Design a protein around this nucleic acid. Sequence first.
DNA 1: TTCAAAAAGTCCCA
DNA 2: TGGGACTTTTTGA
Length: 542
Amino acid sequence: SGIYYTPKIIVDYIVKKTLKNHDIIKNPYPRILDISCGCGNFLLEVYDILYDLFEENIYELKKKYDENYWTVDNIHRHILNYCIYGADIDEKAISILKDSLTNKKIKINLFCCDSLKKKWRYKFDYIVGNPPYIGHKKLEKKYKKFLLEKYSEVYKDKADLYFCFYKKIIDILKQGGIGSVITPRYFLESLSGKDLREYIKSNVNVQEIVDFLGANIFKNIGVSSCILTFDKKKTKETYIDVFKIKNEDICINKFETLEELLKSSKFEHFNINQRLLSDEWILVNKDDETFYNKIQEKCKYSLEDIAISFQGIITGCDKAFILSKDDVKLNLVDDKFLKCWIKSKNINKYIVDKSEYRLIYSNDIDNENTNKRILDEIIGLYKTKLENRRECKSGIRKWYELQWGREKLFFERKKIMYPYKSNENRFAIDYDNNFSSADVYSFFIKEEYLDKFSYEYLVGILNSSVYDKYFKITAKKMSKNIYDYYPNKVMKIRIFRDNNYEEIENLSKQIISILLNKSIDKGKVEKLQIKMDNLIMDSLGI
DNA sequence: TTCAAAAAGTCCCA
DNA sequence: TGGGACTTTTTGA
Ligand SMILES: OC[C@H]1O[C@@H](n2cnc3c(NCc4ccccc4)ncnc32)[C@H](O)[C@@H]1O
Ligand SMILES: [K+]
Ligand SMILES: [K+]
């Protein structure tokens, strides 16, 4: 496949947003383009809107211009000759769209091509549509070479194709033109989006951002969506209207139009000064802005200053190396090769569940002839798969070695761990030398900062409600009740030390002591957490 | 030599 | 089919 249907409410909102206040009398030849038209979800609606626009002013146009040209009977043809433009890579979609535009009642400006390679011969008044989203794993590598060569200002490292579509749209937009598109929301906060953000802020005035957060706009699609509207007008003041959803549980058809949704109690509205955006786009209301600025100002250190961070093991084929601790095959493996192994769901606040899995740290198997039983009966079962790994085909790793085995000495110590995707802050102290995959991240404290910061104090403040809200201010929202907890944002969290250090650390130690008992009652832990939150709010003056 | 980012997620049930 | 639990390894740098 490859063609995705956009909900009609979204299409109507986008077309109306671009064409609401067009002066058809002053310009009866607007050029309106969709470079991912597909079957023409947007373009057919553009035809309807334009037909009403032209018919409403047919006699005014007849008087101001050639009176024989401007007839209702001539509207259709005119629309299809000078106004509607579409491009797509699929021949069948273009043929279907051409048939529909013909049946609305002549040369139709429909192109079957790759929009990122087409030499565009003129700019456009209005651009709308839904571009393709393809990530770094699902993109062919020759095409990635092309993108890296030609779209270097926005496409780099782990970036996405729709970054290039943003750049192309911006480049072929007329002065005073208006663009409105629906894309994934991740570029707003992702590390890969940085350059793209810089390209937008520097080249268009951003009118409006609609952030649906984790709501499901596309049925049976695992993606989170936003709508962006921007222009190239001579702007005096550059202020952005931000509509952020307040309940991800909504159904999009709650009203006849998206405008009713935006103005209702289901959304929140606020304004952001485009001139005040840094390389990061902190899009929050004034209360959250004050909260964030207080926290940033009062804190002297960051986690990056005082800690060393790392990503977990990447075996390359988990079924070959990970076994249940009760699996009989572990009798074939010397215990010097076995490590405790945990998943992201084993990380609670302040402590980790006990391990249920073992990792065969196969890097320390010297010769294949020694311990050949392990290679024959456990790892070799997936040998074919293991040989398709990149470092095996290139020869850097033997077929039975872990793909990215990291350094054991970093794991086999006291450290703090957190899951890579979570609904809330879950920072735990690891006491058991646990190993994990890339779905859990770790850090430990630098030696020179041990006397300023203990592990108990850090898990105490990082697990608080204050720091939950503070981290989620700028965190990358992925899907319903899921944020990314990656070092590129976690290590930028700022921390403090003051008169309340000792009581916070003591409360943290009490919480840890309760959580490790045979008969845990979480209630006193909740009360202690409330008291610690009061201490933190006192320290930060919020 | 070897790090860390990346949801048109994935999979399964009522 | 829609909603909830949970999260691998490929890949550029
Ligand atoms: O998904 C939304 C619609 O977008 C279309 N579309 C996807 N990639 C496109 C492209 N260049 C990118 C490209 C990437 C790899 C190979 C060729 C082209 N140029 C034009 N249209 C493209 C799909 O057919 C859908 O109808
Ligand atoms: K006339
Ligand atoms: K979603």
